[PDB]
Amino acid sequence: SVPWFPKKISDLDHCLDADHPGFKDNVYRKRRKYFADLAMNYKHGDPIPKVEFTEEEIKTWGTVFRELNKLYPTHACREYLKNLPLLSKYCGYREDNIPQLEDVSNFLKERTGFSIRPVAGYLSPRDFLSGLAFRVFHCTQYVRHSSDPFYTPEPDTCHELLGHVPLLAEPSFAQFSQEIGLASLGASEEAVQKLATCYFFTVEFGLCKQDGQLRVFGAGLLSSISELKHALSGHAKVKPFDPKITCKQECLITTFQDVYFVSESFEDAKEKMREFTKTI
Numbered sequence: 001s002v003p004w005f006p007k008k009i010s011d012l013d014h015c016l017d018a019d020h021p022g023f024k025d026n027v028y029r030k031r032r033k034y035f036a037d038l039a040m041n042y043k044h045g046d047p048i049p050k051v052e053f054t055e056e057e058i059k060t061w062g063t064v065f066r067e068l069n070k071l072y073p074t075h076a077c078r079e080y081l082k083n084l085p086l087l088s089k090y091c092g093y094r095e096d097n098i099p100q101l102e103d104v105s106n107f108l109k110e111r112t113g114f115s116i117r118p119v120a121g122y123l124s125p126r127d128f129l130s131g132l133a134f135r136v137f138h139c140t141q142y143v144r145h146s147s148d149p150f151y152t153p154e155p156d157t158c159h160e161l162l163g164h165v166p167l168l169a170e171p172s173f174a175q176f177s178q179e180i181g182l183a184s185l186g187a188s189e190e191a192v193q194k195l196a197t198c199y200f201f202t203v204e205f206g207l208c209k210q211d212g213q214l215r216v217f218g219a220g221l222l223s224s225i226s227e228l229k230h231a232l233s234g235h236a237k238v239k240p241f242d243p244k245i246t247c248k249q250e251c252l253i254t255t256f257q258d259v260y261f262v263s264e265s266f267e268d269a270k271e272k273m274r275e276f277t278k279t280i
């Protein structure tokens with residue numbers, strides 16, 4: 001039989017660790033509970049609760065934003081660079097202001113039909129990919145601990161807003177993402193793992209070749225000052241994106257990646273994934 005999967009957008013309704021650097025910080029710990037409760041209480045159709053971020057949270061965002069913006073012009077793909085200024089104009093991307101999930105959700109709705117729902121923390125690859133099928137991106141709302149703004153193994157709102165949002169605003173990329181989600185719905189465990197891995201080494205950590213140069217489109221790179229620099233250093237190993245090979249690569253979840261895969265274009269990666277999903 002087929003495992004349960006969402007058939008409508010509202011069906012997504014039905015889908016701190018003590019060693020976290022911020023656990024021993026009382027305000028960090030308490031605010032994380034606050035963010036977790038907002039996500040848990042959320043139901044499809046609700047406006048995403050807007051949060052008044054603290055000075056410390058804004059300072060961390062500010063550091064991340066300031067340094068990443070120095071790198072984007074030379075490191076990010078053109079699609080990313082095309083869309084970032086629109087977000088800054090319409091959604092309040094500033095060094096001293098954290099954009100709200102509700103604002104970026106509404107921006108994406110009008111651009112590509114993408115929307116956001118808040119998530120408390122970890123969700124399964126199956127669940128996350130299932131959201132993409134409805135052009136729904138599950139986003140965290142909290143900010144990374146101040147101790148390391150340059151890289152965190154835990155995705156935070158900086159990652160969602162600076163890593164993902166500017167590309168979700170691009171029609172070709174939104175289509176590519178949705179198609180992974182669609183392929184995942186009710187798929188076998190093996191199929192989901194393979195799809196999740198291809199997602200990881202494209203949407204999350206992908207590089208592309210644009211006018212002969214390597215650029216990054218991977219959200220996990222676009223939100224990490226240190227890994228973004230590392231990816232294009234270039235002391236990093238690079239391979240051509242090839243789903244039948246890429247899907248077998250181990251996804252590293254507490255370190256920099258060991259390898260980055262290069263796609264020719266969003267359209268090309270989409271086509272390769274189309275051919276690949278037929279085989280699984």
Ligand SMILES: C[C@@H](Nc1nc(N)nc(-c2ccc(C[C@H](N)C(=O)O)cc2)n1)c1ccc2ccccc2c1
Nearest residue numbers: 121122150151152153154155159204220223224253
């Ligand atoms: C196990 C891990 N899986 C996972 N899958 C994908 N596709 N991307 C990521 C991911 C994790 C961290 C980051 C942040 C990035 N390194 C940065 O420093 O900006 C960006 C992406 N993790 C994960 C996922 C969600 C979590 C939510 C809360 C806490 C831990 C999580 C771990």
Ligand SMILES: [Fe+3]
Nearest residue numbers: 155204219220
């Ligand atoms: Fe991500």
